[PDB]
Amino acid sequence: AQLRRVTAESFAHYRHGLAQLLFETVHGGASVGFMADLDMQQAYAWCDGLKADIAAGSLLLWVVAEDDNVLASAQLSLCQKPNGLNRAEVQKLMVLPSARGRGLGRQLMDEVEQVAVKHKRGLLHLDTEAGSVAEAFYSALAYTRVGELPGYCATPDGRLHPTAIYFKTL
């Protein structure tokens, strides 16, 4: 497996693997923006929705892949607001259920941080389901927990839960 930054030209190659990754992550129970009704057509639509921003460079996308087999992915959304050029949001960090516990998440976040700095972003922030494995993961990676917002979103099963806000100053 190799860590790769996705570009407009390599997007098609990774499209299916990224869609499958969202699919498996959602059905594995994670709160990443979708409900249990998620099907592959919806996952492909989500993927296609990333293409314009990836080509523009406002959204950065990485995958850890073995050829076209996508094992994990992460995204960095660069704030485009005139007064927000110091910040970026980390989103959609996901590792296939069967590829977890092997350091892929850390590999991705290390790259995300390095590239955020190249883009002169001093603040990385994100939000994740409170109490989830992701919370232990970000804490382990030295992100600082700000607090929670109750009823922020629902797990795929429809149950509302709090989201925890984390940040790291680079």
Ligand SMILES: CC(=O)SCCNC(=O)CCNC(=O)[C@H](O)C(C)(C)COP(=O)(O)OP(=O)(O)OC[C@H]1O[C@@H](n2cnc3c(N)ncnc32)[C@H](O)[C@@H]1OP(=O)(O)O
């Ligand atoms: C801000 C947003 O981008 S929130 C979106 C969060 N993503 C998701 O919830 C999707 C579902 N969860 C996942 O895909 C994965 O479980 C991820 C990406 C959090 C973890 O990735 P993995 O690749 O398995 O973790 P990695 O193996 O890189 O772990 C880094 C470390 O995190 C911590 N960690 C990971 N999983 C756990 C866990 N189950 N319990 C406690 N600590 C854990 C550990 O300390 C570990 O470092 P140490 O390995 O030396 O033991």
